[PDB]
């Protein structure tokens, strides 16, 4: 805990007062500390159960990332960040990994980054886990190849949301789903059915739980 903090603290220090370049090494520090106590460096580093220090020492290392903004660093380490996240392998490590893949996605290293880590990801929650998890990223993964402005790729994911959430329908994501369907075909130059999806996504809005964001979109 003590170390972790300190690590922490300091690196945060000189982003806040000097420069990145110094808090960056620090930052390596604090990873390399990390990996060893997760894999025992003397069995947790405050000994007995590992409770707290494991919890702080997961959560600390998700305040590392994004704090370098778009750079090479950060780049290269998220194909890794993951495949430290499967090493975990307890209950609250999904939470950390969807929190961390906001945080990746809304840093800009745009079409490479984003294409491969979560590719990979989507694999990971296909094998074991839950469906549900999967689907999750499904919806990132379809938001992304329209972002990449493969309206065709993109076209042909959402149809598998789509048809497969029809006979499993009664879900607020999905009502996100018609919407991104309109987004489609809007640059297909096609109306006819821009408008027909849109349609669809109002009617699964009648439902009283959709929050602020969904409803401004």
């Not at 704090?67 to 194909?79: C, Q, V």
């Not at 960040?81 to 990746?104: P, R």
Request: hydrophobic share 35%.
């Amino acid at each position: 805990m003590s170390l972790p903090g300190s690590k922490l603290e300091e690196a945060r220090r000189l982003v806040n007062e000097k420069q990145y370049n110094e808090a960056e090494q620090v930052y390596l520090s604090l990873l390399d500390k990390d990996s060893s106590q997760s894999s025992a460096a003397a069995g947790a580093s405050v000994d007995d159960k590992r409770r707290n220090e494991q919890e702080t020492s997961i959560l600390e290392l998700g305040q590392l990332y994004v704090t370098m903004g778009a750079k090479d660093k950060l780049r290269e380490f998220i194909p890794h960040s993951t495949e430290y996240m499967m090493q975990f392998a307890k209950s609250k490590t999904v939470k950390v990994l969807k929190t961390l893949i906001e945080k990746f996605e809304q840093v800009p290293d745009s079409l490479d980054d984003q294409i491969f880590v979560c590719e990979k990801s989507i694999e990971f929650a296909k094998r074991e886990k839950r469906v549900f998890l999967k689907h999750s990223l499904s919806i990132k993964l379809a938001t992304l190849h329209y972002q990449k402005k493969q309206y065709k790729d993109s076209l042909a994911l959402i149809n598998d949301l789509l048809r497969e959430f029809k006979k499993l329908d009664d879900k607020p994501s999905l009502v996100d789903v018609h919407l991104l369907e309109s987004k489609v075909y809007h640059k297909l130059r096609n109306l006819a059915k821009s408008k027909a999806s849109l349609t669809a996504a109002r009617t699964a809005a009648n439902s009283i739980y959709c929050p602020t964001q969904t409803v401004a979109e």
